[PDB]
Amino acid sequence: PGIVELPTLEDLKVQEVKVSSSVLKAAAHHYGAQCDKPNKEFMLCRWEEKDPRRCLEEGKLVNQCALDFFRQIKRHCAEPFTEYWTCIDYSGLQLFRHCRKQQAKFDECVLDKLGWVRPDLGELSKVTKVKTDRPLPENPYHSRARPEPNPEAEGDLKPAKHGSRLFFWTM
Amino acid sequence: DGPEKNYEKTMAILQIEAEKAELRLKELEVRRLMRARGDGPWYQYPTIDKALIDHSPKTTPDN
């Protein structure tokens, strides 16, 4: 049925984040509220294009933008960050309700050195009007042409010519 | 009554019979052809409506 052409191995070398889950989830909200610009249009690319291959250009940017956020903490209160994310992992659910004191310590540090405020409840869960440059695909499913529907029935009803016309029956 | 009564009456019957005969043969041609190519008002066997289908975004990007 054809060619399954896919991107080469050349473009699949991004500076992959080397962190673990706990440190990923320890920041989470601040990372989500400070790196939304590359997240939104890339995810919008994932939905609109309906194909992973066409969103490689945005796929690397979100990973790259993560590093700029991540190393920004290293030049700042990363020691409170280490104490935080090294206390989250100890819980099996990776739950924040048991690490509230370090939640404050990370928040109070990031509040003034950088200014990333704590996202209020429900703020992340919000549809956003992400600006984009790419035009919308003409057919995201690459749908082919459509069969022409059968001609529509019309015309005023007329009495059945010569009645029932079934064997000898008339009228 | 006069023979002209039966003459005209039979002719009207013959015309009615011929049109009835001609229409019957055409119906056997219409119904069979419609059952073959399908592009007709009847014999349209039911399908699934294109309205009952969710087009809102899913939970998985590709679809």
Q: Do residues B12 and B18 lie in contact, with contact meaning Cβ atoms separated by under 8 Å?
A: no
Interface test with B, best of A150, A157, A158, A166 (most B CBs within 10 A): A150
Does B23 contact A165 at a Cβ distance shorter than 8 Å?
A: yes
Q: Do residues A124 and A29 lie in contact, with contact meaning Cβ atoms separated by under 8 Å?
A: yes
Residue A121 sits at the vertex; the CA angle it makes with A34 and A106, to the nearest 5 degrees, is: 55
Q: Do residues A73 and A27 lie in contact, with contact meaning Cβ atoms separated by under 8 Å?
A: yes
Radius of gyration of chain A (CA): 30
Long-range contacts of A92-99 (CB under 8 A, 24+ apart): A94/A21, A94/A22, A94/A25
Q: How many helices (H) and strands (E) does chain B have?
A: 1, 0
Burial label for B18, CB within 10 Å (0-12, 13-18, 19+), is: exposed
Does B41 contact A52 at a Cβ distance shorter than 8 Å?
A: no
Of B20, B40, B62, the CB nearest to A150: B40
Q: State this model's resolution in angstroms.
A: 3.9
A98-125 in b/e form (b: 16+ CB < 10 A) is: ebeebbebbbebbeeebebeebeeeeee
Locus of tokens 């002209």: B4
Residue A13 gets which letter from DSSP?
-
Does B19 contact A162 at a Cβ distance shorter than 8 Å?
A: yes
Burial label for A45, CB within 10 Å (0-12, 13-18, 19+), is: buried
Interface test with B, best of A58, A165, A170, A171 (most B CBs within 10 A): A165
CA–CA gap between residue A72 and residue B35 (Å, rounded): 73
The runs of H, that is alpha helices, within chain A are 21-27, 29-34, 36-48, 56-74, 78-88, 100-113
